[PDB]
Design an enzyme around this catalytic site. Sequence first.
Site, mmCIF file in Angstrom:
data_model
loop_
_atom_site.group_PDB
_atom_site.id
_atom_site.type_symbol
_atom_site.label_atom_id
_atom_site.label_comp_id
_atom_site.label_asym_id
_atom_site.label_seq_id
_atom_site.Cartn_x
_atom_site.Cartn_y
_atom_site.Cartn_z
ATOM 1 N N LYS A 112 0.822 -1.196 0.000
ATOM 2 C CA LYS A 112 0.000 0.000 0.000
ATOM 3 C C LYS A 112 0.831 1.208 0.000
ATOM 4 O O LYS A 112 1.964 1.183 0.456
ATOM 5 C CB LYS A 112 -0.987 0.008 1.161
ATOM 6 C CG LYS A 112 -0.366 0.165 2.534
ATOM 7 C CD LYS A 112 -1.448 0.070 3.598
ATOM 8 C CE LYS A 112 -2.246 1.355 3.773
ATOM 9 N NZ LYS A 112 -1.435 2.500 4.088
ATOM 10 N N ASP B 60 1.562 4.752 1.644
ATOM 11 C CA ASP B 60 1.329 5.345 2.952
ATOM 12 C C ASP B 60 0.160 6.326 2.894
ATOM 13 O O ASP B 60 -0.091 6.929 1.836
ATOM 14 C CB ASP B 60 2.578 6.057 3.485
ATOM 15 C CG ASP B 60 3.139 5.382 4.728
ATOM 16 O OD1 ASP B 60 4.308 4.942 4.710
ATOM 17 O OD2 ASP B 60 2.381 5.254 5.718
ATOM 18 N N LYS C 76 2.570 -1.154 17.423
ATOM 19 C CA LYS C 76 2.912 0.181 17.896
ATOM 20 C C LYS C 76 1.746 1.083 18.191
ATOM 21 O O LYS C 76 1.947 2.126 18.776
ATOM 22 C CB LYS C 76 3.865 0.875 16.915
ATOM 23 C CG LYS C 76 3.260 1.424 15.628
ATOM 24 C CD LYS C 76 4.325 1.717 14.585
ATOM 25 C CE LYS C 76 3.694 2.355 13.369
ATOM 26 N NZ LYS C 76 4.600 2.429 12.193
HETATM 27 O O1 CAP Z 1 2.008 4.620 8.697
HETATM 28 C C1 CAP Z 1 2.152 3.662 9.471
HETATM 29 O O2 CAP Z 1 2.701 3.734 10.597
HETATM 30 C C2 CAP Z 1 1.635 2.368 8.921
HETATM 31 O O3 CAP Z 1 1.992 2.482 7.529
HETATM 32 C C3 CAP Z 1 2.297 1.148 9.574
HETATM 33 O O4 CAP Z 1 3.595 0.941 9.013
HETATM 34 P P1 CAP Z 1 4.488 -0.258 9.556
HETATM 35 O O5 CAP Z 1 3.676 -1.503 9.213
HETATM 36 O O6 CAP Z 1 5.825 -0.120 8.879
HETATM 37 O O7 CAP Z 1 4.572 0.004 11.030
HETATM 38 C C4 CAP Z 1 0.109 2.293 9.055
HETATM 39 O O8 CAP Z 1 -0.423 3.341 8.255
HETATM 40 C C5 CAP Z 1 -0.402 2.369 10.513
HETATM 41 O O9 CAP Z 1 -0.210 1.104 11.190
HETATM 42 C C6 CAP Z 1 -1.873 2.772 10.614
HETATM 43 O O10 CAP Z 1 -2.315 2.658 11.972
HETATM 44 P P2 CAP Z 1 -3.660 1.896 12.289
HETATM 45 O O11 CAP Z 1 -3.355 0.569 11.647
HETATM 46 O O12 CAP Z 1 -3.784 1.989 13.773
HETATM 47 O O13 CAP Z 1 -4.759 2.617 11.569
HETATM 48 MG MG MG Z 2 1.067 4.387 6.728
#
Ligand code: CAP
Ligand code: MG
Lengths: 482, 139, 139, 139
Positions: free
Chosen positions: A203, A205, A335
């Site tokens: 995906k 970001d 996290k």
């Molecule tokens: O931007 C980030 O931090 C991530 O790309 C995680 O990356 P990693 O997999 O490299 O940590 C996701 O967008 C978040 O987890 C969204 O949070 P939630 O899932 O709570 O909506």
């Molecule tokens: Mg992200």
Amino acid sequence: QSVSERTRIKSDRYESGVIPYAKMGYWDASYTVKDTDVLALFRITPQPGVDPVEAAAAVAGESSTATWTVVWTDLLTACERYRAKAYRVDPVPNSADVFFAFIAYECDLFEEASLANLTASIIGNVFGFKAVSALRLEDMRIPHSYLXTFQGPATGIIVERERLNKYGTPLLGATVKPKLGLSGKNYGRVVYEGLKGGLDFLKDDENINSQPFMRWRERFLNCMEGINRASAATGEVKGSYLNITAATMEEVYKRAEYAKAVGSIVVMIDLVMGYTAIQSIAYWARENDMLLHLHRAGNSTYARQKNHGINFRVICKWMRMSGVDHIHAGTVVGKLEGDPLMIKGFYDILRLTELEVNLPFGIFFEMDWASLRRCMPVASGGIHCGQMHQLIHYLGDDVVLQFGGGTIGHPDGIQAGATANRVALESMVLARNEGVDYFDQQVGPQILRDAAKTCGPLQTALDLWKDISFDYTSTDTADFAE
Amino acid sequence: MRLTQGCFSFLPDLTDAQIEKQVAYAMAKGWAMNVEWTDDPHPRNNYWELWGLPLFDIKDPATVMFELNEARKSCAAGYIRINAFDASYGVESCVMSFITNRPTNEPGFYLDRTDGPGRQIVYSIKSYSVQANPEGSRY
Amino acid sequence: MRLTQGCFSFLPDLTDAQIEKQVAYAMAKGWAMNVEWTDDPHPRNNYWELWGLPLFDIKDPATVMFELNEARKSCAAGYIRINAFDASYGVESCVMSFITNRPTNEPGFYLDRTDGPGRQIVYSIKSYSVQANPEGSRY
Amino acid sequence: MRLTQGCFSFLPDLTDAQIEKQVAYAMAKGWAMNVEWTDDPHPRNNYWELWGLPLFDIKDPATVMFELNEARKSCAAGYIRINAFDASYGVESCVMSFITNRPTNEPGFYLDRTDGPGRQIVYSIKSYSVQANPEGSRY
Ligand SMILES: O=C(O)[C@@](O)(COP(=O)(O)O)[C@H](O)[C@H](O)COP(=O)(O)O
Ligand SMILES: [Mg+2]
């Protein structure tokens, strides 16, 4: 004397002046709920000296028909009918200054198929009221009749798996990294590598839209090459969540149409686009054979604290109604904020055909989903394959496990990273189905260390990351334990 | 190359005994099993060939296994999967699908690129096995 | 001409005794009566002028008639109508409107024709009373 | 009717002592005053006629009242207003406008209704004074 004066209303209720919201017929201790009522559960912290029933009735009234002083214009309407009823108030467990308030709204109050209108009434004003020091919308009972006016998921869990030809294990993904700065070229590289190594998806970001460093058309074209190269190399349907988030709705469509035209199976939107664009692009996704992945960006600004805001479980309902196919719903062990109990309830709301009351999971109302389709939860944020036993147990089958850093961070490259995660996953599922007590603190890690003995990339991922945990106290907890 | 359709394809080819256990799981959950064959490995080959009807009534894994081996002995070289199907409301779909058999020499695919408008490309995923020979003599 | 708005305007001007009987009927059904005044007789003049509030907590036709008669004394030459409001689910609207007073002499209207595309006419109805003089001094 | 353009038209007509006081508030804020006249009271009449240039480089309120009185004597029956202009960045606009004179009698307006598409009405507001006579001889 004058006509205005002779025709003044003199009844107790519609004489001019302020009377309390409870004495305006917004409170009834023995209202019987109808199957067509919108129900809302609020967590109300009244100000010092404000009565708990008064604040519950105030919230009822200012979210339906009332205002601060009496208006004769009520009597041009069927005002008995339109008034919301606060109908039950219990104190919140282990606190005598916070209350659970149940409020029922008549069906006809709400524009059919409009989350914008539902929210306009329910969250519009009441959270900023002075008489209330804090206010949180905890749950809602969306009645079958209102639900049938909505599309629900565009594709939904069942049809998604069919378009993917993937049944039996949770699905797999990764966010491309670094978040910002990559050229479209290099984005297409990361997507090819990760998909080729075993991932079903990558995906964009949430904040990758179109920027000086990389304009959106370049990303889309380069990722499509990468995706089709991956599927040619594996004989699997592959994809990447191409982000169509944009400033205007015209631009969002333009990006959606571009995704469609070059053959993408899936697109993403951010929650910060807002409910009206979301509903638009959810209808669009149904009509154009597209998966719609919702990133829940901005959610935790109102969703984090227990004393005030909107619980994410209500956002689940609203987004499943609007019709997004995926939505992030937490990981428990990564996290981002996630209590196992609350995440489980989120997952049930997204996946089940109906809900039965289960207070530990934060499910306050029982509710039919009215054959609206099932929304795919996504588990993302600082997770890794050393946690796979925990992921499977906590999150179940219909879910997408995303490992952005847990794939790309892998010292032997992106393909190595992806492969480690899929072997991890498949062996864990294989094991569960065989009857093995995979969630046991001994067995789970051992199933993976055994799987690592025939998978080099897995040993390495276990060696690098097995200490890593995000062991912190929750903010959004249940009020009833298990 | 290894065709990685099915849900246990980053693991080693499953033994009869490992397949029986997956069948047991699915039968204890109330699901219906079936067996299907193809020698078109294209990712968009939704409909592999039915081997008889799905086994809805059956109360013993050995029956699925017995049918698997009858299919193995009658079908040409190619791919066989077993699917588990859940008729339950709100599912009404396949909930499990894994490869039981795969030919030794899968060449796989090439990506076939046709020029579209501007920079756009029209992709067709092409199988070596399928383009060289007809169904029944591809492996 | 006779302005034939209202539901009894093809009958002779209603007496006070006949008006009260219609008021009494409306109020026996639980309907809220009000009195309204205008000197703009245009068909599309939805909003006549309110003679106070609608008489919501009033059980006595004689009180309604009193406000009709006070409206008659205080208002400039024009039209007065009485309406009956029904606030029930399913209605939430006026269910009876008729004219109680009308001017001695109503010149009426003319139809103003503006050429539109093709043979289409754009029509405007013009009141003679209104075009000639302001509100309060039209009759 | 009263003409309720200007920001003090819901109070009685201002005395010369009151106008002088608002003029002083505006002048202490460093705004430029000007005097304007019209006998078209229409809400869409942007441009009332100028009474000289605006009084830019002027620091005594009585100089504005002096010009007010020359306007009152010289101009036909109708309306006069004083405006206050702020040329500061981010304003560059009038920031206070009020009526100092109005006619003894203002008939006001009627609403002209032309049928559009469907139920749409095309509205026009028509001054009685403007339609009867030319500029200079309307009141
Ligand atoms: O931007 C980030 O931090 C991530 O790309 C995680 O990356 P990693 O997999 O490299 O940590 C996701 O967008 C978040 O987890 C969204 O949070 P939630 O899932 O709570 O909506
Ligand atoms: Mg992200």
